[PDB]
Ligand binder design. Structure first.
Ligand SMILES: NC(=O)c1ccc[n+]([C@@H]2O[C@H](COP(=O)([O-])OP(=O)(O)OC[C@H]3O[C@@H](n4cnc5c(N)ncnc54)[C@H](O)[C@@H]3O)[C@@H](O)[C@H]2O)c1
Ligand SMILES: NC(=O)c1ccc[n+]([C@@H]2O[C@H](COP(=O)([O-])OP(=O)(O)OC[C@H]3O[C@@H](n4cnc5c(N)ncnc54)[C@H](O)[C@@H]3O)[C@@H](O)[C@H]2O)c1
Ligand SMILES: NC(=O)c1ccc[n+]([C@@H]2O[C@H](COP(=O)([O-])OP(=O)(O)OC[C@H]3O[C@@H](n4cnc5c(N)ncnc54)[C@H](O)[C@@H]3O)[C@@H](O)[C@H]2O)c1
Ligand SMILES: NC(=O)c1ccc[n+]([C@@H]2O[C@H](COP(=O)([O-])OP(=O)(O)OC[C@H]3O[C@@H](n4cnc5c(N)ncnc54)[C@H](O)[C@@H]3O)[C@@H](O)[C@H]2O)c1
Ligand SMILES: NC(=O)c1ccc[n+]([C@@H]2O[C@H](COP(=O)([O-])OP(=O)(O)OC[C@H]3O[C@@H](n4cnc5c(N)ncnc54)[C@H](O)[C@@H]3O)[C@@H](O)[C@H]2O)c1
Ligand SMILES: NC(=O)c1ccc[n+]([C@@H]2O[C@H](COP(=O)([O-])OP(=O)(O)OC[C@H]3O[C@@H](n4cnc5c(N)ncnc54)[C@H](O)[C@@H]3O)[C@@H](O)[C@H]2O)c1
Ligand SMILES: NC(=O)c1ccc[n+]([C@@H]2O[C@H](COP(=O)([O-])OP(=O)(O)OC[C@H]3O[C@@H](n4cnc5c(N)ncnc54)[C@H](O)[C@@H]3O)[C@@H](O)[C@H]2O)c1
Ligand SMILES: NC(=O)c1ccc[n+]([C@@H]2O[C@H](COP(=O)([O-])OP(=O)(O)OC[C@H]3O[C@@H](n4cnc5c(N)ncnc54)[C@H](O)[C@@H]3O)[C@@H](O)[C@H]2O)c1
Lengths: 132, 132, 132, 132, 132, 132, 132, 132
């Protein structure tokens, strides 16, 4: 019924802020206590302090009632493991970020719905501009 | 064929020694250089200092030709991802070590051939002795 | 006529539930209240909240007439000290978990009847799956 | 009529190859020798091995008649400085990668034509997939 | 006819007080509230609490008619950016603190009037005491 | 008969390079192995890898035959302790760097010959310029 | 008068408890917040979370009014510097803990009232028992 | 008719030299060759290089007829295990060093004749200097 975002960093925070304002029900997960404080004070969404690879953390995030799980942590193994765990919990759309461009197609096959490579994206973006 | 072992700690080191003494061809992967030095000074096996979650590490380890991949790091997140990365290269016999009992099932359902919980193995072991 | 088990974590919990369910009469010990509460809610057994290295706690657990003492705490010397304490009370069957495999024979030499290393046992287990 | 690109990593390499293949005259700059060897071997183009914040390196890259300067190093300030340098030589088309979103308009205010934050772009690319 | 100084820490505070006492019109800028309270209470001068990389903050500091801009923040790039901003407003006298000696002439090349590396100055001050 | 420099950082390295060239017999001390490698390859002087607060490190540095000991580590307690130990070993001129401007006169009284505050120095420096 | 104790580890915590039970007025300093929480929840004393080498920490601790300053951190470098900083404020009875036997003398000759080596105290203690 | 001492570090070395010099007949044990070499060069005594937790090492040291066993190794359970091993051989006087003060009474309850905590003893010592 809602969306969970793991990794409230440069990618996560911005996405959360933007989604929170667009009128979406979001829940944020971050292993850093101080980051959860900031986010909870600056964003209208529920915040959970903990490791998103842990089942209990996901349960606390309401993993069972989400139709979307986005893992944008700075560690692709956390995003990978997180996403696959979420998938096995019924969630229909999972989005995982990678730091290894060469993992995009690998993560997809393994089951991740959408694999985001900020680097690869930034590149195409720059290329599209030159092509205009 | 070749057997790759990631994580030269209590589990990996023991397994490494035991397997090599039996004639097996093994290659060890560890992110800690000192344990890599120690290892290469005592075991009959190829030792690589690297992150087992990275493409270059697994490839330099002969992952494209290995017959077995065993991830016994102290971080289930690394064991899971790297094993799935090994599977991606064609290795069916992937063995990953987990920290949380719960994943015993999930992880195997997640794509890894065998999931090993030393804590569970220990309990069962104690149980058998008692039932004797 | 009953088994005393200290350390109801990854190893103790599972072992205790398993023994309990098989009709075994068991008494449990854990220094952590939350773990004790969890064990009282899921396992039919006497549950003592205390430090297994303190004689009073062992008294409360019936150390005086138990047929066996099992120390599977996460701390190596706690498991050894408490087992030695159990031994001083007459207990002829002690099982103690260990972290550093190198001391296995010392624990045994000192009277611990069965020394269990989850890591060593897990390495042997994996080794058996390889030999088929 | 060529294009200079500094920083041939996750973003740089991808962009260089994509553009190079699409028939584009390009000169590459990297302070890392082994990265240069790899790019010059897989990408048809001129490769300079130097610090892009050093005028000599820029002169050698032909900054004098370059039509566009692209700094996609992992060091935000290196990208900014080299870009302002490209600017001082008459280059009216600059693209600079940043790490701290907050400085985006500061960069644009100082004259950087296109400011690209991979993190920020990944964020709204993800948000766009949720508005589809 | 005043002087703006950004970053009122170990370098800033000392300079501000020294100059202020020596009868100098000065405006201070710090993003840290408690540092502002302390400086405005011990130094006679205007104190703005904002990010010196933000135009609003500069406008409020009166960058329009300042005769000199001094950025001595602990963040090298903040000092550079704010200084180039001061430059874009017509300030022909800029002083910027740096952390990486290597970029000294890069800073001077981009127009920063005086580049001060506390570390570099301590080094030759020490060397001068050995040539005495 | 010679000079010892502890802390081969922005301050130490530069001072060492400059002193080495001026024809001085210098010995460098640094707790970082990789920093000792660089320095030893780039500078004509003997390098010792170790903690300069330790007697053995100072002995290895030839503390007994030095007429000067300069501690420019990033930790004022290391410089303080280092300098006082050197003094007690006969050395005539000791130079210690501080990170707390308020310690300049304190360190002097305690016995340090010269206490250097790169920050305080950078400030006066900037002030002297404005006064010209 | 007041007794300040820096380093709430095995030595400091025990000393803290023992001294307060005897009616003494004590204040504890520790850089670790959790040990500060634990301490403040069990001891009759003022607890400060801070670096004992910093002016503000010692002043907030009442160093200008204390009668005794005891530095029992696990880093002799910190115990020495802070004690000398205490001496600087007028405190004659400074007690610092050292790690290396050697400094037993040097440190007292270095300015601290009493130098304590628990390792040496332990040896002597064992010696007396044997000579009985 | 002689004292066996294991662990010739900060505590063992000093104690051994002191006992030796007073005419005591002592045999020393240390797992570190360099420490043994150091002890053979400075202390008149038999020096055995080995692991005091291994019976063979204790045999080599004459554990069979020593009047006392002193374990002042830096490892708490090594000191306890070896002392218990010494006890099993008839030795009626064992002294063992400990790290965690909380277990002092357990070691004693288990038969270690004298338990020594350098930290507790040092706290008592300082406490005595305060009471004058
Ligand atoms: N420019 C900068 O200021 C800056 C600052 C910090 C890090 N970085 C870089 O940012 C890159 C990625 O940045 P990003 O936007 O994704 O944010 P980030 O790397 O800064 O942070 C990732 C975030 O996810 C959180 N998290 C939640 N659950 C986690 C879990 N189970 N394991 C680990 N982290 C968990 C982390 O605590 C953190 O807040 C990194 O490679 C790093 O080098 C840059
Ligand atoms: N009681 C104790 O003394 C004790 C001591 C150490 C660790 N532990 C615990 O027990 C377990 C120790 O298990 P173990 O000894 O077999 O393993 P380990 O935890 O000691 O080590 C994991 C190993 O894998 C290595 N490795 C290789 N590639 C890696 C990668 N990409 N990422 C991370 N690590 C990588 C690590 O460097 C390390 O040697 C852990 O879960 C830990 O919590 C307990
Ligand atoms: N990687 C992980 O997520 C993870 C998570 C939890 C625990 N661990 C590790 O598990 C290993 C041991 O696991 P385990 O099976 O024993 O479970 P555990 O580590 O989770 O817990 C040990 C248990 O023994 C209990 N206990 C009872 N009496 C005790 C006493 N006197 N002193 C200390 N503890 C006492 C503890 O309170 C606790 O329930 C450790 O190395 C620990 O770091 C790892
Ligand atoms: N998780 C990971 O394994 C991982 C690995 C590597 C890098 N990273 C992160 O990724 C970020 C960006 O990575 P990326 O691949 O796009 O770039 P990068 O940060 O990895 O590398 C910058 C590149 O630009 C080159 N370069 C050319 N001129 C330079 C100059 N003057 N100064 C510095 N570099 C110069 C460097 O040699 C290098 O190839 C990094 O800042 C780091 O936080 C993460
Ligand atoms: N050893 C230590 O205890 C210690 C303590 C503090 C700082 N430091 C070091 O000292 C270095 C420099 O210290 P310093 O006192 O001269 O300066 P600083 O780095 O400590 O502080 C920078 C100052 O500029 C202010 N400021 C104003 N506008 C700002 C902006 N837009 N962005 C950021 N800061 C802004 C900050 O609020 C702050 O007071 C630091 O980078 C750090 O490495 C060391
Ligand atoms: N701008 C930068 O790149 C940069 C890089 C690193 C650190 N810093 C900052 O630099 C400031 C001081 O810089 P610096 O020029 O003195 O160099 P530094 O702080 O970078 O390094 C101090 C040096 O002394 C060495 N050393 C030798 N003996 C030591 C001992 N016993 N204990 C600790 N270190 C010992 C350290 O290993 C290191 O090489 C710090 O406060 C830090 O915030 C800045
Ligand atoms: N065998 C073991 O289990 C074991 C365990 C921990 C530590 N150790 C060793 O034994 C000794 C422990 O002594 P202890 O328990 O009395 O002290 P400690 O080493 O445990 O702690 C020193 C204390 O002082 C605190 N502190 C306060 N201000 C500080 C500052 N400015 N800088 C640094 N620390 C500051 C630290 O946070 C810490 O609590 C150490 O030398 C260590 O090497 C051994
Ligand atoms: N802060 C420091 O500089 C420092 C320096 C050295 C040692 N230490 C600390 O000292 C504490 C213990 O000191 P200590 O007086 O025992 O001296 P120590 O720590 O220097 O050495 C312990 C000694 O016992 C020896 N030993 C003999 N048999 C052994 C066995 N079976 N297993 C292990 N060691 C055996 C070791 O080889 C060594 O000589 C530790 O917590 C250690 O970290 C601290």
């Amino acid at each position: 019924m809602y969306i969970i975002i793991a990794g409230i960093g440069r990618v996560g925070y911005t996405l959360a802020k933007s989604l929170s304002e667009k009128g979406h029900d979001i829940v944020l997960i971050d292993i850093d206590k101080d980051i959860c404080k900031k986010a909870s004070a600056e964003i209208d969404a529920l915040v959970i302090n903990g490791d998103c690879t842990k089942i209990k953390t996901l349960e606390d995030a309401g993993i069972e009632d989400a139709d979307m799980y986005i893992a944008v942590t700075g560690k692709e193994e956390v995003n990978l493991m997180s996403s696959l765990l979420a998938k096995s919990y019924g969630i229909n759309k999972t989005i995982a970020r990678i730091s290894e461009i060469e993992y995009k197609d690998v993560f997809e096959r393994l089951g991740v719905d959408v694999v985001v490579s900020p680097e690869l994206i930034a590149a195409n973006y720059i290329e599209k501009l030159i092509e205009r």
